[PDB]
Amino acid sequence: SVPWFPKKISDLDHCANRDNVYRKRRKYFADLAMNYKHGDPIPKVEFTEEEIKTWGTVFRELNKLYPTHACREYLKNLPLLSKYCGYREDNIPQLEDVSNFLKERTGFSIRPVAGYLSPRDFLSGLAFRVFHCTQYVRHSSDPFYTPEPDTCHELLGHVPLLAEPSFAQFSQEIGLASLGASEEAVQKLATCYFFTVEFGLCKQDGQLRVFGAGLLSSISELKHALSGHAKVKPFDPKITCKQECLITTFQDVYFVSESFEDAKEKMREFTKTI
Ligand SMILES: Nc1nc(O[C@H](c2ccc(-c3cccc(F)c3)cc2)C(F)(F)F)cc(-c2ccc(C[C@H](N)C(=O)O)cc2)n1
Ligand SMILES: [Fe+3]
């Protein structure tokens, strides 16, 4: 039959909840997400000195790389976020501020999330231009890479591209295609999402650039992706969807899209086939 799926933005309420000082702090963030209901302003957080320091390292080092590494669309939106959302080395932007910024730019909004959602639930949010974002910060011991998404990843990796109309359309269309889809169809869409939105490369003016959020938030993998000691293949949904998504490590392959326009067109033809 058809699995349950959200029919309106508020329906995401029904799925978005599915050392030791660090553990209590993570519990603090998890509770903020769990207690959140659509319509609420997203709770603003007073980040600790250690948290801000970790952000600062990530922010400072990544901004050295972006001009030569990030796609043009990313670079176009990054300064607007400094101006309007408080993106500075000494300040961690608030999810509420960035959500409101996105709402005016592309209709995207943010919802705080306690941890990992199922691909089905995560993608369902995108259908309504809702991006589920973590609020906690990377453990201070490794600013260069983290196996789990943190707020640094959401804010530096995802947000600047969600502010771009062509990318927001591409993202929503993955979400829309997933709604009520088979288990097999969701996995293929989630893999395409992973190798574009999370870890994608694109060719711009003949050169390789990165648009993958998971690359754009990792000092170490961003350098690795374009080094180039990594394997790169063309983005092709029927091939890309079979690729294993790696966690805990750098990816073993990166897929190259021609443009956000082209990636969207390839996804449109592919979703008809499944
Ligand atoms: N969208 C997505 N998926 C990830 O993992 C996938 C994943 C998919 C589904 C689940 C899942 C969770 C809960 C229930 C369920 F059924 C499935 C968990 C992880 C998979 F394992 F497939 F690769 C991992 C990430 C990710 C993880 C970490 C980072 C941080 C980055 N490396 C950095 O250092 O900034 C950026 C992105 N993003
Ligand atoms: Fe992500």
Side-chain angles (χ1 to χ4, degrees):
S1 33
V2 196
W4 175 87
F5 64 90
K7 281 262 168 52
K8 57 192 196 181
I9 189 158
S10 59
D11 283 349
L12 299 171
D13 284 350
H14 312 300
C15 34
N17 267 17
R18 273 78 202 93
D19 35 284
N20 202 298
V21 171
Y22 188 78
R23 273 185 167 271
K24 289 201 84 176
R25 184 66 169 174
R26 287 289 295 263
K27 226 283 259 178
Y28 164 81
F29 284 111
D31 288 345
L32 289 183
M34 290 292 264
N35 290 321
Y36 177 88
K37 299 292 180 201
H38 173 74
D40 291 355
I42 303 168
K44 290 186 162 177
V45 176
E46 301 184 25
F47 291 98
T48 67
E49 285 197 308
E50 185 179 325
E51 285 165 352
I52 297 159
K53 199 167 289 197
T54 295
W55 163 266
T57 294
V58 174
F59 188 86
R60 165 249 291 162
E61 294 298 336
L62 287 167
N63 273 288
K64 284 174 185 178
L65 302 174
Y66 293 150
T68 61
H69 284 71
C71 65
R72 63 169 124 271
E73 296 90 337
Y74 183 95
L75 292 173
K76 187 190 171 185
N77 292 307
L78 212 43
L80 285 312
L81 291 162
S82 270
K83 157 84 97 161
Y84 291 117
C85 291
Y87 280 60
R88 295 188 295 279
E89 293 166 59
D90 68 1
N91 188 68
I92 302 175
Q94 299 290 336
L95 292 189
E96 179 69 7
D97 296 337
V98 297
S99 192
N100 291 326
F101 177 87
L102 287 176
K103 281 188 194 173
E104 59 182 299
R105 290 252 73 117
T106 56
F108 253 86
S109 61
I110 291 173
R111 153 151 215 156
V113 74
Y116 276 112
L117 285 168
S118 65
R120 181 180 295 278
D121 290 331
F122 190 82
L123 296 181
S124 78
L126 299 186
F128 301 91
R129 296 197 177 210
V130 177
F131 203 96
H132 290 82
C133 288
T134 56
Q135 206 165 18
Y136 56 83
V137 180
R138 261 146 150 98
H139 196 266
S140 62
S141 73
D142 196 358
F144 308 96
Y145 173 87
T146 183
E148 55 161 19
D150 73 332
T151 206
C152 298
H153 168 69
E154 320 293 12
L155 296 168
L156 290 164
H158 286 288
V159 169
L161 285 161
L162 299 177
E164 187 71 11
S166 62
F167 189 84
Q169 187 70 30
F170 170 75
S171 294
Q172 178 180 33
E173 285 189 25
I174 298 182
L176 287 166
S178 78
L179 289 180
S182 69
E183 205 63 33
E184 192 181 330
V186 168
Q187 193 222 45
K188 288 178 184 186
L189 286 160
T191 304
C192 287
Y193 167 91
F194 190 90
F195 286 106
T196 50
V197 177
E198 299 286 354
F199 291 94
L201 303 184
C202 57
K203 202 124 82 86
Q204 289 181 348
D205 299 329
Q207 308 175 203
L208 292 191
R209 293 296 179 125
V210 5
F211 73 95
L215 297 172
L216 291 157
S217 61
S218 171
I219 296 152
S220 43
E221 202 169 354
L222 185 59
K223 285 190 281 103
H224 173 70
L226 303 183
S227 50
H229 303 107
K231 162 67 86 274
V232 169
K233 296 272 182 168
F235 172 64
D236 188 10
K238 56 165 165 283
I239 283 162
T240 298
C241 74
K242 275 96 164 77
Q243 201 68 35
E244 189 189 344
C245 302
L246 305 186
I247 31 87
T248 309
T249 58
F250 289 5
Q251 301 309 123
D252 261 54
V253 68
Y254 306 109
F255 295 90
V256 188
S257 296
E258 292 285 296
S259 62
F260 302 152
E261 286 84 357
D262 193 64
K264 188 191 61 186
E265 295 293 344
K266 285 183 181 288
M267 280 308 284
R268 286 177 178 176
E269 72 158 334
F270 175 72
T271 55
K272 281 170 188 200
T273 83
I274 62 167

